[PDB]
Amino acid sequence: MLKPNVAIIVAALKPALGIGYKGKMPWRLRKEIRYFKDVTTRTTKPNTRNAVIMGRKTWESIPQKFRPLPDRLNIILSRSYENEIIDDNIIHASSIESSLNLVSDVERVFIIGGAEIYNELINNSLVSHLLITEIEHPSPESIEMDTFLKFPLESWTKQPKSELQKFVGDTVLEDDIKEGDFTYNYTLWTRK
Ligand SMILES: NC(=O)C1=CN([C@@H]2O[C@H](COP(=O)(O)OP(=O)(O)OC[C@H]3O[C@@H](n4cnc5c(N)ncnc54)[C@H](OP(=O)(O)O)[C@@H]3O)[C@@H](O)[C@H]2O)C=CC1
Numbered sequence: 460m461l462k463p464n465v466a467i468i469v470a471a472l473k474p475a476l477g478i479g480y481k482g483k484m485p486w487r488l489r490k491e492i493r494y495f496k497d498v499t500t501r502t503t504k505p506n507t508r509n510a511v512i513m514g515r516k517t518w519e520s521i522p523q524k525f526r527p528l529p530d531r532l533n534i535i536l537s538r539s540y541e542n543e544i545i546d547d548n549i550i551h552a553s554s555i556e557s558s559l560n561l562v563s564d565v566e567r568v569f570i571i572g573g574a575e576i577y578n579e580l581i582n583n584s585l586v587s588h589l590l591i592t593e594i595e596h597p598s599p600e601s602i603e604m605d606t607f608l609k610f611p612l613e614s615w616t617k618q619p620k621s622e623l624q625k626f627v628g629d630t631v632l633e634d635d636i637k638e639g640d641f642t643y644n645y646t647l648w649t650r651k
């Protein structure tokens with residue numbers, strides 16, 4: 460696949476944009492994990508699937524029994540990997556672009572984490588869209604976080620919900636979702 464548009468999908472706690480703590484997510488938001496699954500799996504074209512790209516640490520964090528993530532082509536990046544097709548669902552690569560050369564019959568490509576991947580790939584021009592779940596809490600300072608996004612948001616524009624709706628198609632987008640003390644909303648950003 461030559462020069463696909465790539466989207467970053469992430470959930471972050473405002474205002475610092477914290478995303479993890481000691482290798483894990485700092486929260487358990489049930490509806491948010493379901494949205495992630497629906498967005499990353501759904502396709503419009505016929506015999507296609509989406510691709511999800513992740514760093515090695517993120518892959519290793521999913522229990523072995525639950526990987527690869529079903530119904531999507533999984534791509535795992537490591538600086539130590541040769542570009543190799545493991546099976547029909549798993550690819551090893553050392554660069555985003557080399558990995559895409561190995562794929563076909565993919566509709567959309569999503570970068571799914573983690574921190575290092577996000578922070579480096581945000582500056583790659585292949586990245587055209589950001590799907591950020593913006594989480595709010597009454598006392599964000601009480602949530603222990605060690606990992607944060609370093610995104611240059613002054614160069615991106617947050618779109619109206621109508622554009623997000625168009626991006627996700629059929630997916631139901633509820634507003635101000637509350638789970639425990641967290642309140643969240645889904646958003647779409649594009650480059651200025
Ligand atoms: N809030 C959210 O939506 C999400 C949060 N996370 C959180 O992220 C954290 C994990 O992030 P982190 O520890 O940074 O790990 P990553 O998942 O980003 O993996 C880092 C590894 O990826 C490889 N890698 C990184 N950058 C590159 C590159 N540019 N080219 C090739 N290989 C690369 C390296 O593998 P090697 O060392 O083998 O070279 C590196 O060690 C956890 O807290 C996790 O819960 C994860 C996903 C979503």
Ligand SMILES: CCC(CC)n1ccc2c3c(N)nc(N)nc3ccc21
Pocket residue numbers: 468469470484491492495520521570571572592
């Ligand atoms: C499904 C496996 C887990 C492991 C951390 N996971 C990995 C990536 C994501 C993930 C992501 N990238 N974006 C958003 N919005 N939500 C997520 C929820 C869970 C995630």
